[PDB]
């Protein structure tokens, strides 16, 4: 069975709720396992001397009606992040598409540059198909994602810190 992982989200001071996500290990096992391990923190310290762990990290770029981006746990701004495989890993496949709200997909800087950054879609983002690896979807707490999305802005700056206060596997 496909693993399921969670984020407990903080928006400013406020506990916003739990987002639960299913990871498509049956289609993107390598991408899924990276994300999964980053939720647990089980791989320890990486090559930048930072825990390979989403706990504490923020959704630094939120664009209402498009997506929420996070996973940059080494620099908090979109320039950092690393995979459990060592820096960046290969695009696993493009079998799955950006089919609608809730889809998890990998942020990158071009072909084969997958690290730790990801996005949760808040709409169908089909123009990204074949360039970003789709590896999961939100199955519970999508309303928490709606709430994150209200704190974001057109250019992506958030008017409140959106942070992953806790995370892990179920």
């Amino acid at each position: 069975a496909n693993p399921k992982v969670f984020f407990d989200i903080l928006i400013g001071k406020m506990k916003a709720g739990r987002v639960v996500m299913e990871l498509f290990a049956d289609v993107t096992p390598r991408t899924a396992d990276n994300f999964r391990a980053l939720c647990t923190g089980e791989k320890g310290i990486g090559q930048a001397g930072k825990a390979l762990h989403y706990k504490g990290s923020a959704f630094h770029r939120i664009i209402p009606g498009f997506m929420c981006q996070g996973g940059d746990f080494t620099r908090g701004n979109g320039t950092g992040g690393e995979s459990i495989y060592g820096a960046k890993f290969q695009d696993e496949n493009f079998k799955l598409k950006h089919t609608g709200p809730g889809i998890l997909s990998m942020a990158n800087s071009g072909p084969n540059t997958n690290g730790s950054q990801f996005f949760i879609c808040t709409d169908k983002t089909a123009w990204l198909d074949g360039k970003h690896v789709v590896f999961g979807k939100v199955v519970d707490g999508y309303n928490v994602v709606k709430a994150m999305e209200k704190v974001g802005s057109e250019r992506g700056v958030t008017s409140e810190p959106v942070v992953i206060e806790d995370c892990g596997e179920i």
């Binding site: 770029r61 979109g78 320039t79 990158n108 800087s109 540059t113 690290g115 990204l128 970003h132 992506g156």
Partner: peptide, 11 residues
């Protein structure tokens, strides 16, 4: 994207 944010709606 992850480092240079560009035009349109990218990640």
């Amino acid at each position: 994207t992850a480092g240079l944010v560009l035009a349109x709606l990218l990640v």
